[PDB]
Structures are given as C-alpha cells and as structure tokens.
C-alpha cells in the first residue's frame, strides 16, 4: 500500500462542541442558467459562436443548494482549545450523481462572524472537504457518518493552499472525543491561522494529524496532492463518477473568472459511491484571530437537456434549462434564445 506518514501521537482526540443554530444563517443563493454560473463546460465537445443544445449532468435552475460553513472552536482569548462544527457529521447525503460547490462568492464582502453574531469581519474564502463512502454506518457512540469502509476522502492541506485526496479504510481509535473513544461528539479537522496559516509557512501535516487523531488510515490505495492555486475570487469545484474513473473538475485550474468546469484530476476509483459528507473542517483560533468564513454550497448534478450559447472566446456565457419554465422549454425549441411571440402548446 502507500504510507500515510506518521500516525497521531495523541490517544485522546480534541473535545468537540456542536452549535448548529449559530451555523444556520439566512441568505439567497439561487443558480441562474442565463448567468451560466454552475453550468459545466463539456471537455468532449468544443463549439464556435453558433448556439447548440446538448445533454449533460447539470444542476436544475432555481436550486438554492445546501449551505455549508466552518467556524472557529470556542476559545479563551489566551488559548483556543474547543473545536466547532455543525452537525454535518451525522448528516449523510447520497452521492447519486456527484455535486458542484461554489466558493469565494461570500469573500470580498463584510459579514458577521459565524461563532459570534456581534463580531463582524471581512469574509475569507474557504475550501470544502468531502469524504465519500459506498456504505455509512452509525458509530458505537451513536454518531452517524462513521462509515469506516468509506474510500474517497478529499481534504484541503496547508490551509487550502493545496488539495489532498486519498482512499483508505478508516480505523476507529480509543480516546476522549474519538469516535470509538470516550466522550465522542463529532469528528473535525483543525487549522491554526497563527502558526499553520502564517504567511510563508503552511503545514499540510497539521490538517492530516487532526484527521489521523479521529481515524487511523489503513489499506491506503493511493496518495494525491494538487497545488492548484489560491485566490479570493469565485471558484466552482465539481466531482462526478464515471465508469472509466472518478472525474474531478475545477474552474480555478483553467479560467477562475469564467466559472466553466474543466477536468483537472482523474481518480482511479471503480467502486460505486452511495454517500458523501461535507464541511467537517473546523478552525482553531483565538477570539482576535476569528474572522467571517466563506461557505461551500452543494448543487446536485442530474441528466438535463440544456440550450448552450458559446461566445467568440468559446466559453459558454448564456445557458437555458429546458426542464424548468414553459418559456424556457419554448426557447429550447427553434434552437433560439429569443423566440417570436406566438401561442404555443406545452406538456
């Protein structure tokens, strides 16, 4: 197999405090086909200015999606000890066709800090962590999401500077706050702004160590690290499962501004995945260090006929969903974004 590096030296995991109500927030995040945000670009076909209709996995228009955010643990001003995560550990979502996430939209704007409503800081872009498993089972403590057999864990490393992907069988450990251990509440990953995220120093091991404390890694098929790029601009990440291999698409790799999806990595997993988990990451920081955090939003891909318009650059800037809206279905007919006024029968 492939070495996972040194195992956690701490038998007891860091204690976890769950505050779902604080994490919950009210905001509007509706995908728009005309904007073309959340619309994938097909690697298989490249087209010129003329518009064409193609069938591909696409999120339905008007989907708010699932809002996922990470917050700093409860901390005294001198010392940060507790870890804060919403109950997404016990929340399991089926991996029916994969999902697309949007990151950095919140960043570049000032918002109330998630842990403390009174505190307000400029929002900072964050990278989501996704663990996918064919079978998910409840832990001995009774917390859900302890799949154990799950083989597809992707977590950001060096405070999101690089992405780490590995498939391993999770091993339960006996320690305070560990899943098979005493005082088990949740499993989280901690990154520290003062040392781990200090400018010029990024520690991939610190994020890996937090995951190791909760779960040891055994039977590890492969280790993958992608440096990619980090910037405070809107980015889209899409994960899809195909018969040949699991395919990973990132907007940042090709055009960050375009938002178009281009495959950047290929994962050799031929096992069907029926479940996934999102936002298990947590921040370890003092009260002054805490800042508003950007969030990751899940949009489920589904087979969907779509009208696509490609500009002179060739990137799609206009899209129409035939399924949603009678007028949009009429627009798909005649292969025209604008249709002459008429009375038309609909299903």
């Amino acid at each position, epitope marked *: 197999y492939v070495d996972v590096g040194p195992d956690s030296v701490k038998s*007891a995991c860091i204690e976890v405090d769950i505050q779902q109500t604080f994490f919950d927030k009210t905001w509007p995040r509706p995908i728009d086909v005309s904007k073309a945000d959340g619309i994938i670009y097909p690697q298989g076909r490249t087209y010129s200015n003329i518009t064409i209709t193609y069938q591909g996995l696409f999120p339905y228009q008007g989907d708010h999606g699932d809002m996922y955010v990470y917050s700093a643990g409860h901390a005294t001003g*001198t*010392t940060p000890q507790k870890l804060f995560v919403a109950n997404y550990s016990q929340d399991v979502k089926q991996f029916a066709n994969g999902f697309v996430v949007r990151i950095g939209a919140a960043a570049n704007s000032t918002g109330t800090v998630i842990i403390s409503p009174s505190t307000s800081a400029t929002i900072r872009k964050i990278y989501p962590a996704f663990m996918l498993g064919s079978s998910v089972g409840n*832990f*001995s403590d009774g917390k859900m999401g302890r799949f154990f057999n799950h083989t597809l864990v992707l977590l950001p490393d060096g405070c999101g500077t690089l992405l780490r992907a590995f498939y391993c069988i999770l091993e339960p450990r*006996s320690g305070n706050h560990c899943p098979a*251990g*005493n*005082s088990y509440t949740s499993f989280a990953t901690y990154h520290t702004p003062a040392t781990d995220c200090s400018d010029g120093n990024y520690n991939r091991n610190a994020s890996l160590n937090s995951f190791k404390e909760y779960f040891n890694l055994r039977n590890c098929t492969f280790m993958y690290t992608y440096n990619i790029t980090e910037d405070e601009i809107l980015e889209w990440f899409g994960i899809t499962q195909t018969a040949q291999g699991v395919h990973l698409f990132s907007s940042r790799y090709v055009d960050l501004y375009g938002g178009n999806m281009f495959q950047f990595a290929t994962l050799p997993v031929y096992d069907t995945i029926k479940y996934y988990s999102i936002i298990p990451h947590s921040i370890r920081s003092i009260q002054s260090d805490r800042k508003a955090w950007a969030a990751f939003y899940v949009y489920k891909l589904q087979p969907l006929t779509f009208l696509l318009d490609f500009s002179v650059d060739g990137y799609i800037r206009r899209a129409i969903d035939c399924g949603f809206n009678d007028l949009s279905q009429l627009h798909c007919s005649y292969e025209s974004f604008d249709v002459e006024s008429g009375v038309y029968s609909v299903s």
Partner: antibody
Amino acid sequence: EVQLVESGGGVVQPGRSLRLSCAASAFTFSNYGMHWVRQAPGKGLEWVAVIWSAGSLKYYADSVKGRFIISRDNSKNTLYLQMDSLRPEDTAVYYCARENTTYYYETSGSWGASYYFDFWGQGTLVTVSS
Amino acid sequence: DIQMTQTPASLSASVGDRVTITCRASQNISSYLNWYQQKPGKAPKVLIYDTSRLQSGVPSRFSGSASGTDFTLTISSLQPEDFATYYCQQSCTTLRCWTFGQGTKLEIKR
C-alpha cells in the same frame, strides 16, 4: 451537583462472582468516560478498569484479565462491573470516577487546563470472606 | 511497564516548614506526571495534572516541579491540615494501565 452512588458491594465467598453498580446523578455519563480505581488497605489507589462512553473498547489491568467486565448503559445511567474468582488479597475499596484528558495547544504559548476530575466516587469496601 | 518509587516514603515536617517530596518517573517518553493529595478515609483530590496548572482550592505554596527523571513536590507554610498522603502517577497515552502511588503521609515534628 454530580453525585456518584455505588451498590452491590458486600462480603462474598472466594471464587464467587459479584456485581458492582455505579449510578451517576445529574451527570453526563453518556458523553463522559468512567475510570475505576481500587484502594487496598495500607496501599495507594491503583486503576483497575476503564469503560469508554461509547463502550466499544474496555481496558483492564494486567493483573486482572477477563476477571473484570465493565458495561456502560447510557439510558440506565448505571455502570456495571463484574468481578469473578475473587480472593482475600483482591479485597479492596472500589471507586468509580470520571477523568477528562488534559490537552494544551501552544499556538502562541497557549495552555488549556482541560480538567474535569471533580466529584470523585465515594467507593464501596468489598471483603472476600466466609 | 511503569515502575514508580517515592524516595522519602514518610516525611517528618513541623508547622511552617519547607519540605520537598521527590518521586521518580519511569520513562521520559510520556510528559504527563500528576500529583494527588489524599485524606485518609476520603477519595484523593487532584493537585496537578500537566504540571502547568494549579487546582482551585489548592494554595500557591504547594507546587510541582520536574527535573530530569525525578519530579519533586515543594510545600511551604505547612499546617496539620496540610499534611496528607500523596500519590504521584505517570499518565501515558500509549499505556492504558495507570501507575500506582506508594503514598507519602507527613508526620509532625514535636
């Protein structure tokens, strides 16, 4: 506020199984691990058995292997310890107590006490005699 | 395994006196050494755990200092109430077993 009460401690014939029950009042037994300590007269307290809050893994002292069985029922709020093949030397006072791991992360010379050893169990004296 | 011996064993200490109680540490692999103050007929009361904290209700005069392989408990302004048996146990993440305490009760000089 937390109260620990121990029952089932009594004089027992040698080689006869005995059941010890520890009950927690106003205590989060479901999310707290339990550590058992035995005191021998004229000697210091020594840990004998630990029951995880999850209860998946239970650890026992090298001297007693399979002699001590620890069962933690969250709904009951009572922890059951089973002692078998008891001997005159084994006679001791058994206390059920909760220990919280002390962890300090020095991001900037930062230390966290992380201590919850308060409300030590009163303990029950069990004598092996006939 | 862990082998722990307290070199003083019993301390003859007068009131308002300074005494040091030294107990050896079996291994430097684990840095967690803790001191427990026990009153006879009563459960032990924690004094120190990571050696960086002072228990609430415990005076500053009681202090725990570890040098090399030996950890010493330093007590000042000793009182008849202060005198008690003391157990120091090594705590190891790798080893499930917890170290026994020899016991160091303090008699009063007269």
